Design a protein around this ligand. Structure first.
Ligand SMILES: [Ca+2]
Lengths: 62, 235
């Protein structure tokens, strides 16, 4: 209702473009698609850009 | 990188290393399977450069490395080293044969001009490379990384006798000790946004490395994204 690209990026995870009646349209970079919630971005290909896909799991002991 | 840490394998899967007359002389970033973005001062039309993706330790074999030849070098059309060595410090390398993307060889995302700048203004990015680990010191064997804060433009201008152009930005630490360095040029300054990394800068230049009151200077990628997208399009 009150949603706008000027405030918190329209709640879009990546990109926002204003739509009619103080609604936005969210969108994603190449290799991602919009999630169910129409806000978040999820991979649409196997090795999408900008994603670290190898576990960084590490730990410091004494 | 001075004062950084060793990367983990796969931590920076967009990072490449350039080998030429000198090995590991510069870095780069994967734009897509056929294209690398790097610094213009690193390269020049016709000198033999090879790119290695999937690299971690430059003296050992990890069996994740992908080595490609460069078929075309495209320095930005505004770059002119005879006028200024570091203005418009950006170039594209076309690989002869595509990379095969996987967890160790993944492109960096590149947003539009507006969002690139929005991302840069978050104010914290990661730089990485196999450059010198001290000013005039030894280079790294294992890929190094460092988080660097964005430095206010006026602060950066006051720090130097040199000219910082609008297509450059400053990042680093006032107290010194941590910075990109010789041999890191061309590698990525990236900003992580909700878990996805976007290219925000190219490692470019500085006055020594890691000295107090001096900053690293970086090519402002937002100024070049249309050109990158147009030159590198595969479809
Ligand atoms: Ca290696």
């Amino acid at each position: 209702m009150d949603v706008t690209c000027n405030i918190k990026n329209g709640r879009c995870e990546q990109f926002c473009k204003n739509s009619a009646d103080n609604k936005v349209v969210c969108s994603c970079t190449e290799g991602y698609r919009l999630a169910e919630n129409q806000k978040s971005c999820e991979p649409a290909v196997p090795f999408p850009c900008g994603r670290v896909s190898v576990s960084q799991t590490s730990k410091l002991t004494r | 990188v001075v004062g950084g840490e060793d990367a983990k394998p796969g931590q920076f899967p967009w990072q490449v290393v350039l080998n030429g007359k000198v090995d590991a002389f510069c870095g780069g970033s994967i734009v897509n399977e056929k294209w690398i973005v790097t610094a213009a001062h690193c390269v020049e039309t016709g000198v033999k450069i090879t790119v290695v993706a999937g690299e971690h330790n430059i003296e050992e074999t990890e069996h994740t490395e992908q080595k490609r030849n460069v078929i075309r070098i495209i320095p930005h059309h505004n770059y002119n080293a005879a006028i200024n060595k570091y203005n418009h410090d950006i170039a594209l390398l076309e690989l002869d044969e595509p990379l095969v993307l996987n967890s160790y060889v993944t492109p960096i995302c590149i947003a539009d001009k507006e969002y690139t700048n929005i991302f840069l203004k978050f104010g914290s990015g990661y730089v990485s490379g196999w450059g010198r680990v001290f000013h005039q010191g030894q280079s790294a064997l294992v890929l190094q990384y460092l988080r660097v804060p964005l430095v206010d433009r006026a602060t950066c201008l006051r720090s130097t006798k040199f000219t910082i152009y609008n297509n450059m930005f400053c990042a680093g630490f006032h107290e010194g000790g941590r910075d990109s360095c010789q041999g890191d040029s061309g590698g990525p300054h990236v900003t992580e946004v909700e878990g996805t990394s976007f290219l925000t800068g190219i490692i470019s230049w500085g006055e020594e490395c890691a000295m107090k009151g001096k900053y690293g200077i970086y090519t402002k990628v937002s100024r070049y994204v249309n050109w990158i997208k147009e030159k590198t399009k595969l479809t």
